[PDB]
Amino acid sequence: MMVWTPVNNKMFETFSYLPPLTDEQIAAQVDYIVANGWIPCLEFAEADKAYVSNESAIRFGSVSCLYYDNRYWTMWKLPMFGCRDPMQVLREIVACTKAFPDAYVRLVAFDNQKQVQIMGFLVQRPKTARDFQPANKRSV
Amino acid sequence: MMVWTPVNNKMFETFSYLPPLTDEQIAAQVDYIVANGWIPCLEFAEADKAYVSNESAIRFGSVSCLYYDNRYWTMWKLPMFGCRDPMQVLREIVACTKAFPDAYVRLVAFDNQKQVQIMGFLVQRPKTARDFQPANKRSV
Amino acid sequence: MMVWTPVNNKMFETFSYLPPLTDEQIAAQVDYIVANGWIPCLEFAEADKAYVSNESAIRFGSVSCLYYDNRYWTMWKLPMFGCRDPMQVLREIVACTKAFPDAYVRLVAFDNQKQVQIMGFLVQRPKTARDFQPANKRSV
Amino acid sequence: GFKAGVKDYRLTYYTPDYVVRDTDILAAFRMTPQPGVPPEECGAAVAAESSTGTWTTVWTDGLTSLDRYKGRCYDIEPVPGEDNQYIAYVAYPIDLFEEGSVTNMFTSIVGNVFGFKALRALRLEDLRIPPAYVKTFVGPPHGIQVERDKLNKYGRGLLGCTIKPKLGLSAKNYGRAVYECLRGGLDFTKDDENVNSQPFMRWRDRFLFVAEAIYKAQAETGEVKGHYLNATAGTCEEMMKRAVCAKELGVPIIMHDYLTGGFTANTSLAIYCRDNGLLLHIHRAMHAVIDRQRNHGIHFRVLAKALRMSGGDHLHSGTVVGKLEGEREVTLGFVDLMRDDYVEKDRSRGIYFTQDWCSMPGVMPVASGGIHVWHMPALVEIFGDDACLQFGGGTLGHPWGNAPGAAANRVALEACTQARNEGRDLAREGGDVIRSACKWSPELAAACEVWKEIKFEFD
Amino acid sequence: IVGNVFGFKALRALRLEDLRIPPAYVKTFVGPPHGIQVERDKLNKYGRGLLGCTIKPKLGLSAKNYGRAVYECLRGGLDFTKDDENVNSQPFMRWRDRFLFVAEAIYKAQAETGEVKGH
Amino acid sequence: IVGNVFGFKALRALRLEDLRIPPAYVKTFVGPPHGIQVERDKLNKYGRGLLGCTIKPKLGLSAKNYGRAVYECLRGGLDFTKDDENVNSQPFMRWRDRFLFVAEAIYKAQAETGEVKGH
Ligand SMILES: O=C(O)[C@@](O)(COP(=O)(O)O)[C@H](O)[C@H](O)COP(=O)(O)O
Ligand SMILES: [Mg+2]
Ligand SMILES: [Mg+2]
Ligand SMILES: [Mg+2]
């Protein structure tokens, strides 16, 4: 019997329970994105503004149901509308990580028919980050 | 007349007002546990999540009566059901402290008839802990 | 396409989106003040008390609409009533920054007919301040 | 003229020449008349006694316009492979219905007729809710998009888990189980449908401890977490009392048993939820009493349309592959009926009418009951991302406890999603994807080992 | 009791035929607001069944007409009339309108017959 | 529909002449509290136009005088009288004073004529 660690095992939604994505696994996702006609976009956040919290709820009455700070990250440029080129997306991931080496960066895609974000996964963790575990040391 | 110190004299519920338990006093408790048919279990917490606080009450209305964070610790494996072996419990205490050298660790036992935790005391304090007093320096 | 940075690009109301004021651009504002009959005054705040927050709202009911801490800075001496001398204001800016080298300092001006502050811009940022950006590094 | 006495319903209520109006509510009943009762008469009886008519001629008819108000049987198909079974189509004018009231709609259409001597069995298969009627409903408090937006969760199914045993756990223990499941990687846990407030665990105690588990798990994982606290109760006042406390605790989501609670109580709750930003999970407790048999009852697709109108953010859709019945083609149909804006007629999937929801939000299908890690690819294949999959036993039954149980299922789902996205066909390479992941993840491996032989196929 | 079991793959069909509600469970319920005896006592009606009557057509009648039909029924010697189960509030007759006119009918029939009337 | 557009530089004049309100939108409105049929039923008035009368002078009459005028109009055979559109509550006549006196007028005219009256 192995024990799943509480310290410090912070996850990041879709695909963070899998092994970290290879530059080619990331490219396979981008193909899936362009294949389906979805709008790609990049978002980023500094170390603090990355996790869900609720310090603005100090200003609220009894209305803090489904309110959490740090859902919104900062948009890299604009979403790439009708841009059906997998190459150019990968280039923007690079441009972005280069510009914010210390930021959390995620790739997201929008469906405009259902008007919703249809997929999203992390592409860069900052190097100073000490609150995650490598895939093998998650249970002791 | 001696004065009971306010700094930093943090206690830990049952038995934390006695002198720290010898490996054999611990074993004597475990005998008592198995003698009575109770289910032993181990719980642990990192340095922060160890003490009772209330930072989630920022999300509440007037309903924070008998709500405190960090009552729940993290369960080590599972509770040891019908495991009537004092040796094996002591081994799990060791397995646990070994896996989390920096954690608070406590031994607890459940009565399943009354459905309540029936005893519980601390078995490991982390080494970095500076907020407790040795039994003799509690009063100056 | 350049991206406007979220880190740490903290601004300061009027004129903080322009390039920092030259000693002579500052003096040009003071001429405008005195030319219009407005009362000059100086305000200052330590590194913490400079930015708008809301830690006193912990004591509030549902009445924290348009309440923020740190709107009020500390007054340097008194407002300079009917003092129609541009020279003497500049001298007080100096006297002030001298006395509080580590403080945020702003120059403000009151219209007493409308009874409102009629202008205000920063004149000193403390040297330890790491949460602003120079005008050219605001977009990458 | 007023002519006292009994006559045939067909004289007034069978109109096979009628052109349905864009605002008529349409019903498709699976009729089985008594031997010697002509289909046309039986169909008219159903139309009559579900709208304006009784058993003998009343004089008051003349004071109003029976033409304007009557239910009309307007078409009868014989059922292939059936001696005495027909599909009778009834059109009801919009005027017949109270705006916004699922209760009223069901009172007319399924109120009395199912008990008629003149028939052996009756089944309501489908309803066509016209846009002009749909627009009278508040409908779901949030719906799929808004829910995903509120929870900040995208590009995969959601994972949940009913705490077990169903009954018997104390409040403190409940919260303990909840924390362990949530921190392993499940999004949601839930009260069992029959966990309300009982001698072993009073609701407010539970709500408090569960709120604490939700918050510990959230801080630990950094992902948003939830627990469907049950507001189902004996009286509306109690139901509200619980919903209020949940709001007061800041938790994201409550659940209601709409069918045992009832439509009236449910619509109330959904409105409260809309007004307070609470997510509303709907449990379909008791549906099988009504929807299981082919010859008699109301088919679930109707009970799902109803729920969408009454209001709910989630509704249990069944698993197909799990411990409870659910045929695959029909399920794919009512899942479209739950989620989509516009669903074209398709008799292969039991969809008798084109249903236009006119922008009413979508309900998230919840797949739950007797499922484990080996079903994962079949599940992802059936429902896609917009679904919530739940593992009760499949989590609290894992040999290493709830956190590893959770972790297992989360890895299983994440693997299939990646597989699907990378191009792999999940209907075929299913077992492969799972197997690759067990050899990779210890926790998943332990799970696959225990439930490898376990399937639900019968007769 | 009837929550999930009816939908099990392991069975073809299930029917709940009866339940034994023990007194100790029974006592936790407010139960019926009045009950037979008290109803009779309130209505002042004894030694016979009570007579009732659903207004017809089920739907389509205006509030004014509804009341009219009620009055005629009640004065003839029926104890009660009733809204049809699906008479709630609809475009052809809104409930408050109905309630008012029916109240008037009830009182007119009561005064005329000297017997207690209801709807 | 009529929010901004009428003020556009790119046009000289705009007029909205009609709207098609579709049934699906119409169904979302409570609409009129009663409507013609229910009104007639409530008032018990059938088979002719109804007769009304705005009290004059528009402004300047006291509450007591208002009621007086009302009673005289109503008793002569008008169905309704009414406050002038700009009669609300003012220094020469406060609304509650008027309501009370008018109520009295309505009832007097009603008892006298035996016809339902209103203001
Ligand atoms: O009570 C139960 O059995 C469950 O909690 C599942 O538990 P397990 O995951 O442990 O099986 C659900 O309520 C059923 O899914 C309801 O069925 P349905 O979805 O058809 O309404
Ligand atoms: Mg359940
Ligand atoms: Mg009836
Ligand atoms: Mg006028």
Closest CA to E108 of E92, E97, E119: E119
Q: Could you give the CA distance from residue D313 to residue D228 in angstroms, rounded to a whole number?
A: 12
Q: Which residues pair with D49 in a beta bridge?
A: none
Could you tell me the distance, in angstroms and rounded to a whole number, from the CA of residue E103 to the centre of ligand 3? 20
Cα-flanking dihedrals φ and ψ of residue D53, to 5°? -100, 150
Contacts of B46 in chain A (CB under 8 A): 6-8
Structural domains of chain D, ranges and CATH numbers in brackets? 11-137 (3.30.70.150), 138-451 (3.20.20.110)
Which ligand ends up closest to the CA of D323?
1
Structural domains of chain C, ranges and CATH numbers in brackets? 2-140 (3.30.190.10)
The answer to whether the beta carbons of residues A82 and A69 sit under 8 Å apart is no
Q: Count other Cβ atoms within 10 Å, centred on residue D200.
A: 12
Query: What does DSSP assign to residue E7?
Result: G
Touching pair F, C by Cβ (3+ pairs < 8 Å): no
C-alpha to C-alpha distances, B91 to B85, B97, B98, B124, D405, nearest whole angstrom: 10, 10, 10, 14, 24
- Return the residue whose CA atom lies nearest to atom 2 of ligand 1: D369
Cβ separation of D179 and B72 shorter than 8 Å? Answer: yes
**Does the beta carbon of D392 lie inside 6 Å of ligand 1?**
yes
Q: Count other Cβ atoms within 10 Å, centred on residue D427.
A: 10
Instruction: Provide the pairing of β-strand D355-356 with B116-124.
Output: unpaired
- The annotation status of F41 as a binding-site residue, yes or no, is no
Task: Output the CA torsion sign for E1, E4, E6, E12.
Answer: negative
Give the H/E segment covering residue D66: helix D66-69
Give the H/E segment covering residue A107: strand A104-111
What was the experiment behind these coordinates? X-ray
Write the CB contacts of D22 (distance below 8 Å, at least 6 apart in sequence): D130, D132
The b-or-e profile of B102-121 (16+ CB within 10 A means b, else e) is ebbbbbbbbeeeeeebebbb
Q: Could you give the CA distance from residue D213 to residue A45 in angstroms, rounded to a whole number?
A: 27
Q: Which of E3, E8, E88 sits opposite D104 (nearest CB)?
A: E88
Cβ separation of D23 and F28 shorter than 8 Å? Answer: no
A-B contacts at Cβ under 8 angstroms: 27
Q: 3-class DSSP state for residue D77?
A: strand
Torsion over CA of C20, C24, C30 and C34, rounded to 10 degrees?
Answer: -160
| Residue D26 distance to chain B (closest CA, Å) | 47
Distance of CA C131 to the CA centre of its chain: 16
Q: Count other Cβ atoms within 10 Å, centred on residue D202.
A: 13
Could you tell me the distance, in angstroms and rounded to a whole number, from the CA of residue D437 to the centre of ligand 2? 29
Q: Could you give the CA distance from residue B71 to residue A126 in angstroms, rounded to a whole number?
A: 32
Contacts of B66 in chain D (CB under 8 A): 208
In the stretch 36-65 of chain A, residues with CB closer than 8 A to chain D read 51-52, 57, 62-65
Closest CA to D25 of E96, F27, F34: F27
* Helical packing angle, D203-221 and D171-184, nearest 10°: 20
| Residue E58 distance to chain F (closest CA, Å) | 19
- Which amino acid would we find at residue D198? Q
**Does the beta carbon of D85 lie inside 6 Å of ligand 1?**
no
The answer to whether the beta carbons of residues F53 and F80 sit under 8 Å apart is yes
The answer to whether the beta carbons of residues B108 and B41 sit under 8 Å apart is yes
**Does the beta carbon of D384 lie inside 6 Å of ligand 1?**
no
Residue in the block written with tokens 């029976």: D66
Subunits with 3+ Cβ pairs within 8 Å of D are: A, B, E, F
Pick the residue from chain A with its C-alpha nearest to C6. Answer: A74
Q: Could you give the CA distance from residue B39 to residue B30 in angstroms, rounded to a whole number?
A: 10
- The annotation status of F58 as a binding-site residue, yes or no, is yes
Contacts of A59 in chain C (CB under 8 A): 54, 57, 64
Q: Count other Cβ atoms within 10 Å, centred on residue C15.
A: 16
Task: Output the CA torsion sign for D270, D276, D281, D283.
Answer: negative
Q: Is the peptide bond before E57 cis (omega within 30 degrees of 0)?
A: yes
Q: Could you give the CA distance from residue D28 to residue D31 in angstroms, rounded to a whole number?
A: 9
Instruction: Let me know if D91 is exposed, middle or buried by CB neighbors in 10 A (0-12, 13-18, 19+).
Output: buried
Give all strands of the β-sheet with A116-124 in edge-to-edge order: A74-76, A39-45, A104-111, A116-124
Q: Which two tokens stand for residue B85?
A: 């072996």
- Which amino acid would we find at residue D212? E
Residue in the block written with tokens 């046309």: D40
Instruction: Let me know if B1 is exposed, middle or buried by CB neighbors in 10 A (0-12, 13-18, 19+).
Output: exposed
The answer to whether the beta carbons of residues D216 and B69 sit under 8 Å apart is yes
* End-to-end Cα, chain F, rounded Å: 36
Helices marked H in B1-85: 23-36
Task: Output the CA torsion sign for D205, D207, D212, D213.
Answer: positive
**After which residues, if any, is chain A broken (C to N > 2.5 Å)?**
none
The b-or-e profile of A19-46 (16+ CB within 10 A means b, else e) is eebeeebbbbbbebbbeeebbbbbbbbb
Q: Could you give the CA distance from residue B55 to residue D215 in angstroms, rounded to a whole number?
A: 10
Instruction: Let me know if D196 is exposed, middle or buried by CB neighbors in 10 A (0-12, 13-18, 19+).
Output: buried
Which ligand ends up closest to the CA of E57?
3
Closest CA to D281 of D174, D411, D405, D187: D187
- Atom number of ligand 1 nearest to Cα D316: 19
Q: Could you give the CA distance from residue D358 to residue D377 in angstroms, rounded to a whole number?
A: 32
Q: Per CB distance under 8 Å, which residues of A are interface residues toward B?
A: 1, 3, 6-8, 54-55, 57-58, 61-62, 64, 140
Closest CA to D176 of C127, C124, F95, B110: B110
Residue in the block written with tokens 């919290």: A53
The b-or-e profile of E27-58 (16+ CB within 10 A means b, else e) is eeeeeeeeeeeeeeeebebeeeeeeebebbbb
**Does the beta carbon of D162 lie inside 6 Å of ligand 1?**
yes
Cβ separation of D324 and E8 shorter than 8 Å? Answer: yes
The answer to whether the beta carbons of residues C52 and C104 sit under 8 Å apart is no
Q: Could you give the CA distance from residue B76 to residue B30 in angstroms, rounded to a whole number?
A: 17
C-alpha to C-alpha distances, D112 to D76, D107, D122, D125, nearest whole angstrom: 20, 8, 11, 16
Q: What is the DSSP string of D359-370?
A: TPPPPEEEEESS
Cα-flanking dihedrals φ and ψ of residue B79, to 5°? -65, 150
Instruction: Let me know if D434 is exposed, middle or buried by CB neighbors in 10 A (0-12, 13-18, 19+).
Output: buried
Closest CA to E57 of C54, B74, D57: D57
Q: Which two tokens stand for residue D9?
A: 């319903």
- Return the residue whose CA atom lies nearest to atom 5 of ligand 1: D162
Task: Output the CA torsion sign for F20, F24, F25, F27.
Answer: positive
The answer to whether the beta carbons of residues A43 and A97 sit under 8 Å apart is no
The b-or-e profile of D403-424 (16+ CB within 10 A means b, else e) is bbbbbbbbbbbbbbbbbbbeeb
In the stretch 55-74 of chain E, residues with CB closer than 8 A to chain D read 55-62, 65, 69
Q: Which two tokens stand for residue D278?
A: 């609470």
Q: Which two tokens stand for residue D50?
A: 């579900």
Distance of CA D328 to the CA centre of its chain: 15
Could you tell me the distance, in angstroms and rounded to a whole number, from the CA of residue D162 to the centre of ligand 1? 7
Q: Count other Cβ atoms within 10 Å, centred on residue A106.
A: 21
| Residue F48 distance to chain D (closest CA, Å) | 20
Q: Could you give the CA distance from residue C76 to residue C92 in angstroms, rounded to a whole number?
A: 9
Which ligand ends up closest to the CA of D285?
1
Could you tell me the distance, in angstroms and rounded to a whole number, from the CA of residue E65 to the centre of ligand 3? 17
Q: Could you give the CA distance from residue D257 to residue D286 in angstroms, rounded to a whole number?
A: 9
- Which amino acid would we find at residue E19? L
Q: Could you give the CA distance from residue E94 to residue D99 in angstroms, rounded to a whole number?
A: 11
Write the CB contacts of F73 (distance below 8 Å, at least 6 apart in sequence): F53, F55, F81
Which ligand ends up closest to the CA of D113?
3
Query: What does DSSP assign to residue C63?
Result: -
The answer to whether the beta carbons of residues D14 and D41 sit under 8 Å apart is yes
* End-to-end Cα, chain E, rounded Å: 36
Show which residues of F are catalytic.
Answer: 56
Residue in the block written with tokens 């003040």: C33
Q: Could you give the CA distance from residue B45 to residue E22 in angstroms, rounded to a whole number?
A: 47
**Does the beta carbon of D405 lie inside 6 Å of ligand 1?**
no
Residue C39 sits at the vertex; the CA angle it makes with C33 and C40, to the nearest 5 degrees, is: 70
The answer to whether the beta carbons of residues D433 and D415 sit under 8 Å apart is yes
Helix count and strand count (H, E) for chain E: 4, 0
F37 touching E, CB under 8 A? yes
Q: Which two tokens stand for residue B62?
A: 């007037």
- The annotation status of F81 as a binding-site residue, yes or no, is no
- The annotation status of F4 as a binding-site residue, yes or no, is yes
Contacts of D417 in chain A (CB under 8 A): 14-15
The b-or-e profile of B67-100 (16+ CB within 10 A means b, else e) is bebbebbbbbbbbbeeeeebeebbebbebbbebb
Query: What does DSSP assign to residue C66?
Result: T
- Which amino acid would we find at residue B28? A
Q: Could you give the CA distance from residue A119 to residue D365 in angstroms, rounded to a whole number?
A: 19
Cα-flanking dihedrals φ and ψ of residue D11, to 5°? -60, -35
* End-to-end Cα, chain B, rounded Å: 9
The answer to whether the beta carbons of residues D208 and B66 sit under 8 Å apart is yes
Q: 3-class DSSP state for residue D317?
A: coil
Q: Which residues pair with B116 in a beta bridge?
A: B111
Q: What is the DSSP string of D408-419?
A: HHHHHHHHHHHH
Q: Could you give the CA distance from residue D72 to residue D47 in angstroms, rounded to a whole number?
A: 6
Q: Which two tokens stand for residue D448?
A: 């696959």
Closest CA to B72 of C29, D174, F11, A58: D174
Cα-flanking dihedrals φ and ψ of residue A16, to 5°? -80, -5
Q: What is the DSSP string of F34-99?
A: S-HHHHHHHHT--SS-----B-SSSS---HHHHHHHHHHHHHHT-SB-B--TT-SSBTTB-HHHHH
Per the annotation, the verdict on D70 as an active-site residue is no
**Does the beta carbon of D156 lie inside 6 Å of ligand 1?**
no
Q: Could you give the CA distance from residue E95 to residue D104 in angstroms, rounded to a whole number?
A: 13
- Atom number of ligand 1 nearest to Cα D391: 9
**Does the beta carbon of E7 lie inside 6 Å of ligand 1?**
yes
Residue D360 sits at the vertex; the CA angle it makes with D365 and D262, to the nearest 5 degrees, is: 65
The answer to whether the beta carbons of residues A80 and A41 sit under 8 Å apart is yes
D8 touching E, CB under 8 A? no
Closest CA to D447 of D382, D389, D403: D403
C-alpha to C-alpha distances, F10 to C80, D349, F4, F6, F14, nearest whole angstrom: 52, 54, 12, 10, 11
The answer to whether the beta carbons of residues D131 and D25 sit under 8 Å apart is no
Q: Which two tokens stand for residue F47?
A: 């088979």
Q: Is the peptide bond before F57 cis (omega within 30 degrees of 0)?
A: yes
Q: Could you give the CA distance from residue D336 to residue D351 in angstroms, rounded to a whole number?
A: 10
Residue in the block written with tokens 């899942």: D335
C-alpha to C-alpha distances, E25 to A76, A87, B48, D240, E19, nearest whole angstrom: 63, 70, 47, 24, 12
Q: Is the peptide bond before D165 cis (omega within 30 degrees of 0)?
A: yes
- Atom number of ligand 1 nearest to Cα D164: 10
* Helical packing angle, A86-99 and A23-35, nearest 10°: 130
- Residue E2 CB-half CA count within 13 A: 17
Q: 3-class DSSP state for residue D381?
A: helix
Q: Which of D212, D249, D250 sits opposite B72 (nearest CB)?
A: D212
The answer to whether the beta carbons of residues B27 and B90 sit under 8 Å apart is yes
- Residue C75 CB-half CA count within 13 A: 7
Write the CB contacts of D107 (distance below 8 Å, at least 6 apart in sequence): E85, E86, E88
Radius of gyration of chain B (CA): 17
Cβ separation of A18 and D418 shorter than 8 Å? Answer: yes
- Which amino acid would we find at residue D381? E
The answer to whether the beta carbons of residues B116 and B110 sit under 8 Å apart is yes
Residue D315 sits at the vertex; the CA angle it makes with D309 and D319, to the nearest 5 degrees, is: 140
Q: Count other Cβ atoms within 10 Å, centred on residue A57.
A: 18
The answer to whether the beta carbons of residues E55 and E86 sit under 8 Å apart is no
- Which amino acid would we find at residue C113? Q
Distance of CA D226 to the CA centre of its chain: 20
In the stretch 287-346 of chain D, residues with CB closer than 8 A to chain A read none
Could you tell me the distance, in angstroms and rounded to a whole number, from the CA of residue D394 to the centre of ligand 1? 11
